Write an enzyme that holds these catalytic residues in place. Structure first.
Site, PDB file in Angstrom:
ATOM      1  N   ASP A  87       9.309  -0.980  11.170  1.00  0.00           N
ATOM      2  CA  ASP A  87       8.041  -1.658  10.905  1.00  0.00           C
ATOM      3  C   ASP A  87       8.041  -3.168  11.162  1.00  0.00           C
ATOM      4  O   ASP A  87       6.978  -3.795  11.089  1.00  0.00           O
ATOM      5  CB  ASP A  87       7.569  -1.380   9.473  1.00  0.00           C
ATOM      6  CG  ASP A  87       6.917  -0.018   9.330  1.00  0.00           C
ATOM      7  OD1 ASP A  87       6.966   0.756  10.297  1.00  0.00           O
ATOM      8  OD2 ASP A  87       6.353   0.281   8.259  1.00  0.00           O
ATOM      9  N   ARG A 115      -6.839  -2.028   7.961  1.00  0.00           N
ATOM     10  CA  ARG A 115      -6.387  -0.943   7.095  1.00  0.00           C
ATOM     11  C   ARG A 115      -5.028  -1.140   6.459  1.00  0.00           C
ATOM     12  O   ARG A 115      -4.733  -0.514   5.447  1.00  0.00           O
ATOM     13  CB  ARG A 115      -6.426   0.392   7.852  1.00  0.00           C
ATOM     14  CG  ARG A 115      -7.848   0.816   8.110  1.00  0.00           C
ATOM     15  CD  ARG A 115      -7.958   2.067   8.949  1.00  0.00           C
ATOM     16  NE  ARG A 115      -9.362   2.373   9.211  1.00  0.00           N
ATOM     17  CZ  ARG A 115      -9.786   3.322  10.045  1.00  0.00           C
ATOM     18  NH1 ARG A 115      -8.910   4.074  10.712  1.00  0.00           N
ATOM     19  NH2 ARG A 115     -11.088   3.527  10.200  1.00  0.00           N
ATOM     20  N   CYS A 168      -3.145  27.514  10.113  1.00  0.00           N
ATOM     21  CA  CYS A 168      -1.822  28.132  10.150  1.00  0.00           C
ATOM     22  C   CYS A 168      -1.049  27.924  11.443  1.00  0.00           C
ATOM     23  O   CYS A 168      -1.618  28.043  12.522  1.00  0.00           O
ATOM     24  CB  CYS A 168      -1.900  29.592   9.686  1.00  0.00           C
ATOM     25  SG  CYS A 168      -0.321  30.457   9.686  1.00  0.00           S
ATOM     26  N   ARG A 224       5.617  21.181  10.963  1.00  0.00           N
ATOM     27  CA  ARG A 224       4.652  20.097  10.839  1.00  0.00           C
ATOM     28  C   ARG A 224       5.072  19.226   9.673  1.00  0.00           C
ATOM     29  O   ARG A 224       5.805  19.668   8.803  1.00  0.00           O
ATOM     30  CB  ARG A 224       3.256  20.652  10.569  1.00  0.00           C
ATOM     31  CG  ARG A 224       2.922  21.846  11.412  1.00  0.00           C
ATOM     32  CD  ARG A 224       2.187  22.867  10.592  1.00  0.00           C
ATOM     33  NE  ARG A 224       0.757  22.787  10.806  1.00  0.00           N
ATOM     34  CZ  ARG A 224      -0.129  23.594  10.241  1.00  0.00           C
ATOM     35  NH1 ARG A 224       0.272  24.555   9.409  1.00  0.00           N
ATOM     36  NH2 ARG A 224      -1.416  23.442  10.528  1.00  0.00           N
ATOM     37  N   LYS A 278       0.865  -1.168   0.000  1.00  0.00           N
ATOM     38  CA  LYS A 278       0.000   0.000   0.000  1.00  0.00           C
ATOM     39  C   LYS A 278       0.918   1.239   0.000  1.00  0.00           C
ATOM     40  O   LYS A 278       0.610   2.243  -0.612  1.00  0.00           O
ATOM     41  CB  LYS A 278      -0.871   0.033   1.258  1.00  0.00           C
ATOM     42  CG  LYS A 278      -1.806   1.236   1.290  1.00  0.00           C
ATOM     43  CD  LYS A 278      -2.576   1.337   2.576  1.00  0.00           C
ATOM     44  CE  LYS A 278      -1.647   1.576   3.742  1.00  0.00           C
ATOM     45  NZ  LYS A 278      -2.428   2.011   4.899  1.00  0.00           N
ATOM     46  N   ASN A 279       2.063   1.155   0.670  1.00  0.00           N
ATOM     47  CA  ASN A 279       2.937   2.327   0.742  1.00  0.00           C
ATOM     48  C   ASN A 279       3.657   2.686  -0.542  1.00  0.00           C
ATOM     49  O   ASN A 279       4.313   3.705  -0.610  1.00  0.00           O
ATOM     50  CB  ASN A 279       3.912   2.192   1.905  1.00  0.00           C
ATOM     51  CG  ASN A 279       3.202   2.145   3.242  1.00  0.00           C
ATOM     52  OD1 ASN A 279       2.153   2.776   3.415  1.00  0.00           O
ATOM     53  ND2 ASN A 279       3.769   1.412   4.199  1.00  0.00           N
TER      54      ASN A 279
HETATM   55  C1  LIG Z   1       0.646  30.309   8.227  1.00  0.00           C
HETATM   56  C2  LIG Z   1      -0.085  30.922   6.981  1.00  0.00           C
HETATM   57  O1  LIG Z   1      -1.186  31.727   7.138  1.00  0.00           O
HETATM   58  C3  LIG Z   1       0.381  30.660   5.706  1.00  0.00           C
HETATM   59  O2  LIG Z   1      -0.230  31.193   4.589  1.00  0.00           O
HETATM   60  C4  LIG Z   1       1.590  29.753   5.510  1.00  0.00           C
HETATM   61  C5  LIG Z   1       2.329  29.746   4.338  1.00  0.00           C
HETATM   62  C6  LIG Z   1       1.951  28.833   6.647  1.00  0.00           C
HETATM   63  O3  LIG Z   1       3.004  27.976   6.563  1.00  0.00           O
HETATM   64  C7  LIG Z   1       1.092  28.875   7.901  1.00  0.00           C
HETATM   65  O4  LIG Z   1       1.765  28.338   9.015  1.00  0.00           O
HETATM   66 CA   LIG Z   2       3.678  27.137   9.012  1.00  0.00          CA
END
Ligand SMILES: *[C@@H]1C(=O)C(O)=C(C)C(=O)[C@H]1O
Ligand SMILES: [Ca+2]
Ligand SMILES: [Ca+2]
Length: 419
Positions: A305, A397, A115, A120, A22-23
């Site tokens: 894994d 899954r 945002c 992340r 699947k990956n």
């Molecule tokens: C914050 C945001 O409003 C925006 O347009 C970008 C590019 C981000 O990475 C968000 O964290």
């Molecule tokens: Ca950001």
């Protein structure tokens, strides 16, 4: 929540036919958005995310149908937005962004969390497309990418290995003007398979599988046929099933070279292993396994894994073994559960000290991680009495018909619905 009621002890042996990864199917399916002509992707498992991906692609204007193959016609893709309702259950949906901007100069994917200042997982994909010349922003709940004309090839140096961003950058790079070089690229077989798929469409890529991938942009990609590679973790999982039950088994439709470290370690545990082009056999000759020492690291080293499964192996092996996690130093949810089944083990930071016992005892257990859950099912297969593994939907899954596959190996297992 569905559960598996397993009864042991049983010896697991016979044959099993390995499903496609699947990956690898997932990134390949999104990479197919680049193809201007029909494509046939073979050996695609029938799993939730695949169906989720099919619906997402269809919403973009892709003609999609499947069986063991998934047939794609993205010739008329004409909607460049992946909505909340279609992406909500799947993080991998960010993979639609790169192909879209690379081929259409625009794309937007619904993203939860709005945002944020903090780094992340999504950002790596964003930085990669920015390096390639796209303008990106987050607004009204979407990540939106655009570029006037074509992307531009660049020399990219990855701070940390990322399978997800490598795919995004490599996929998008195939339609970029000029050459792109990804330093410290992800090396996983899934990246190799995705690179090979792009090439079968007419892309120019070299280095896949090493820490550096080089792509040479082309005007457009055509269509074709490509077969997703076998799921190496499912393979290792079944190999371990036999290894821990004094069994013997043959895995069909496998690919040995994606499992070097796992095989070498299974041999150290006392398994008699033979391999061919597309199959692997393992024989314990009725013997208990020997404890081994394991250290997870990036591919081609031992895979995290396979870590829970090997923890289980050490716990029923002769001797003491040490499992060390360097990828996810907190992924030991299975240990406390195996201890409730009669095991003996100490968790020390990012390692588990295992002291193999003779036989496990049935118990009610559960883990929320797919691999740990599969490991608890295997433990139930060899434990004395009845075991009830709860919340098996994690397994549903990521493993195709694991219930049938185990029953054919001699498992005494049953799915319990309802409450
Ligand atoms: C914050 C945001 O409003 C925006 O347009 C970008 C590019 C981000 O990475 C968000 O964290
Ligand atoms: Ca950001
Ligand atoms: Ca914004």
């Amino acid at each position: 929540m569905d559960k598996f009621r397993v009864q042991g002890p049983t010896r697991l042996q016979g044959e099993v036919t390995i499903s496609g990864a699947k990956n690898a199917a997932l990134p390949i399916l999104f990479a197919a958005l680049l193809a201007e002509e029909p494509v046939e992707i073979q050996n695609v498992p029938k799993l939730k995310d695949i169906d989720t991906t099919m619906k997402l692609l269809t919403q973009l204007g892709t003609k999609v149908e499947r069986x063991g193959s998934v047939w794609i016609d993205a010739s008329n893709v004409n909607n460049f937005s992946a909505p909340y309702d279609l992406v909500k259950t799947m993080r991998a949906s960010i993979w639609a962004l790169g192909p879209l901007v690379a081929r259409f100069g625009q794309g937007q994917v619904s993203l939860p969390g709005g945002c944020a200042i903090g780094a992340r997982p999504v950002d790596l994909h964003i930085f990669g497309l920015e390096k390639l010349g796209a303008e990106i922003k987050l607004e009204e709940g979407y990540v939106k990418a655009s570029v006037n004309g074509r992307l531009k090839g660049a020399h990219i140096v990855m701070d940390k290995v990322s399978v997800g961003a490598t795919v995004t950058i490599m996929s998008a790079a195939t339609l970029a003007e000029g050459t792109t070089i990804i330093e410290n690229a992800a090396r996983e077989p899934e990246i190799v398979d995705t690179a090979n798929f792009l090439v079968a469409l007419g892309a120019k890529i070299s280095g896949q599988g090493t820490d550096r991938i080089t792509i040479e942009g082309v005007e457009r990609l055509g269509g074709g046929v490509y077969r997703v590679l076998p799921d190496r973790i499912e393979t290792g999982t079944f190999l371990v099933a036999a290894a821990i039950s004094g069994g013997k088994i043959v895995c069909r439709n496998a690919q040995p070279d994606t499992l070097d470290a796992v095989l070498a370690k299974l041999r150290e545990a006392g398994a008699d292993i033979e391999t061919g082009e597309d199959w692997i056999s393992l024989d314990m000759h009725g013997k208990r396994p020997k404890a081994v020492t394991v250290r997870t690291a990036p591919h081609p080293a031992f895979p995290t894994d396979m870590q829970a499964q090997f923890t289980l192996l050490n716990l029923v092996a002769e001797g003491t073994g040490v499992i060390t996690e360097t990828i996810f130093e907190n992924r030991f949810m299975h240990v406390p559960e195996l201890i409730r089944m009669g095991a003996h083990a100490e968790i020390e930071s990012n390692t588990v000290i295992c002291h193999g016992v003779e036989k496990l005892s049935g118990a009610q257990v559960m883990a929320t991680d797919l691999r740990a859950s599969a490991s608890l099912v295997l433990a139930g297969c060899i434990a004395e009495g009845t075991t009830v593994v709860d919340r098996i939907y994690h397994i549903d899954r990521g493993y195709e018909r694991i219930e049938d596959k185990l029953r054919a190996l001699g498992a005494n297992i049953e799915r319990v619905k309802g409450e």
